[model samples]
Structures are given as C-alpha cells and as structure tokens.
Target: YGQVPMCDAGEQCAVRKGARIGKLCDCPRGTSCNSFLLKCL
Candidate 1:
C-alpha cells in the first residue's frame, strides 16, 4: 500500500468543517482523522 494521502489540505481537515465521502459534517466533532481513514459516530 502507498502512504496515506492527506485530505484536501486547507479545506477537508480539522478546522474548516469539510466534506467527507461526499457528505458534509463538522470536522471538529466526533470525527477522528488518521493517516488513511476517518472514524466517527
């Protein structure tokens, strides 16, 4: 496997409340961002 790619740097990260897998949600909520995956409630 390749190194995990970062989500759209300034957008889909843990600050600006970004979209994931085509759905938008609060980025700073229960969502946890790892190297290759995002886990949440």
Candidate 2:
C-alpha cells in the first residue's frame, strides 16, 4: 500500500483529491466517479 495501490485511479483519485488531476472528481462532494473523467454529475 506504499505506492497508491501501484495501479490506476491513483488510489481512488489519490485519496479523493490530494493528487487532484482532471476528471473533476468528487463531483461537488457526492464522491462517486467512473473516470470518463466525469465521475458523477
């Protein structure tokens, strides 16, 4: 668990926002995404 699961999602958006990139995660705090880069809207 030392490298963000060593795969995609970056450990689920890097702890949900720490590694905050594109995809507009959290979708205003509902926090459920599918990474079409648009988790939920």
Candidate 3:
C-alpha cells in the first residue's frame, strides 16, 4: 500500500538516505527511494 521510486544503479539506493526520522521499515532492501523520512517510514 505505498509507492516505490526507481532505485539508482538498479535497486541500489532502495534503502534511502535522508534524515533518520523513525524506525526503518522492512520494505525489502534494494527497492527504490530518494530519502528516508520519519512519519513516512
């Protein structure tokens, strides 16, 4: 029930790299993301 962006280097940046807001979710590594937020996580 969410949106998955295109990962850089073909599913390399799926973990996202931004301000660590809350607990990191288990959305399956190597998915796709731009940055990891709090509430969004």
lDDT to native, each model: 0.38, 0.37, 0.36
Model 1 per-residue lDDT tens digits across residues 1-41: 53343444234433223543543333444445442443332
Q: How should the candidates be ordered by TM-score, best one leading?
A: 1, 2, 3
lDDT of 2: 0.37
TM-score of each: 0.21, 0.20, 0.19
Residue range 1-41, candidate 2, lDDT tens digits: 23321223322432334555443223334444554443342
* C-alpha lDDT of residue 7 in model 1: 42
Sort all candidates by lDDT, best to worst. Answer: 1, 2, 3
Output the lDDT of residue 25, model 3: 41
- Model 1: weakest 10-residue lDDT segment is 8-17
Q: What is the lDDT of candidate 3?
A: 0.36
* Tens digits of lDDT, candidate 3, 1-41: 65544333333333433644332343345443335331222
What's the distance in Å from true for residue 38, model 1? 6.5
Q: Per-prediction count of colliding residue pairs?
A: 0, 1, 0
Cα deviation at 2, candidate 1, in Å, is 29
Which pairs clash inside model 2?
Answer: 33-39
CA deviation > 4 Å runs, candidate 2 = 1-25, 28-31
